[PDB]
């Protein structure tokens, strides 16, 4: 194994969940989690560069972007390392998901933050000034530090 991690998501609201990370290979990282308390629909999921929870989720910073890339969806090669796309919450508000990522690596995100947003990540395709920056996903709902 080349690294494992877990992040407990919490915020000043009903959103809360647990997401785990496992570096299967040097070039493939498994991400699985369950988040409750969400509005039914798509919600953006991103790794931010600072695990600073001193001000809700606002002190966590921008999307983890060590290569200086533009915002994108998981299938775009030009994307922030922390760009994980959207996850969908069912009618009951629960979002169960499982994905592999070929750029995000566990050892490089230990101590950073994982945030889920209130709206949909437009994957850089929304024709909005925030599309190439954040994905125009709105407010941050819950966050948590990627722990060892």
């Amino acid at each position: 194994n080349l690294g494992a991690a877990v992040a407990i998501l919490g915020g000043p609201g009903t959103v809360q969940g647990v997401v785990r990370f496992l570096q299967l290979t040097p070039e493939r990282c498994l991400i699985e989690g369950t988040i409750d308390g969400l509005e039914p629909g798509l919600h953006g999921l991103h790794v931010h560069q600072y695990g600073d929870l001193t001000n809700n989720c606002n002190s966590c910073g921008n999307h983890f972007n060590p290569d200086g890339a533009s915002h994108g969806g998981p299938q775009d090669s030009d994307r922030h390392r922390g760009d994980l796309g959207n996850v969908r919450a069912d009618a009951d508000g629960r979002a169960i998901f499982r994905m592999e990522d070929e750029q995000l690596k566990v050892w490089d995100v230990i101590g950073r933050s994982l945030i889920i947003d209130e709206g949909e990540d437009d994957l850089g395709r929304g024709g909005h000034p925030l599309s190439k920056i954040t994905g125009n996903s709105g407010e941050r709902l819950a966050c948590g530090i990627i722990a060892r």
Partner: protein
């Protein structure tokens, strides 16, 4: 990294913020912050092995002890890496914290980023209690508030 932060939270009134900073490679790490809601006196102040708090103190584990040594105080040579001694809460419950340690680090095998920082119920006896529990937790007691050490700007 050069800086780290941790927000201590718990089921009781114990809560605070602890900052970390290291300006030299494998050098000293300044640990400073504030905690409130404590009982007046000395309280254990340790870094545990894992940041996983899905099960609370069970998943956080023992003191961060990569060198497989017995419990001690920060000034002792036989200590856990996560052994940072006690903090002092005044008569109002506020614990103005300021520690400097070079066994911990913000890099390398002794890196504490991503682990759990816990303020405990009782005072750490620095591994000098005579019983075996002193060689494990210093009889510091239960967890009052905890948090994950995350990278800060």
């Amino acid at each position: 990294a050069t800086k780290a932060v941790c927000v201590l939270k718990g089921d009781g009134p114990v809560q605070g913020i602890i900052n970390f900073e290291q300006k030299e490679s494998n050098g000293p790490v300044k640990v400073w912050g504030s905690i409130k809601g404590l009982t007046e006196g000395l309280h254990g102040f340790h870094v545990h092995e894992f940041g996983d708090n899905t099960a609370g103190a069970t998943s956080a584990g023992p003191h961060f002890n990569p060198l497989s040594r017995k419990h001690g105080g920060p000034k002792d040579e036989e200590r856990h890496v996560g052994d940072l001694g006690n903090v002092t809460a005044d008569k109002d419950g506020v614990a103005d914290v300021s520690i400097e340690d070079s066994v911990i680090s913000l890099s390398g095998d002794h890196c504490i980023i991503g682990r759990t920082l816990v303020v405990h119920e009782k005072a750490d006896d620095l591994g000098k209690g005579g019983n075996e529990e002193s060689t494990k937790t210093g009889n510091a007691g239960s967890r009052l508030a905890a948090g994950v050490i995350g990278i800060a700007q």
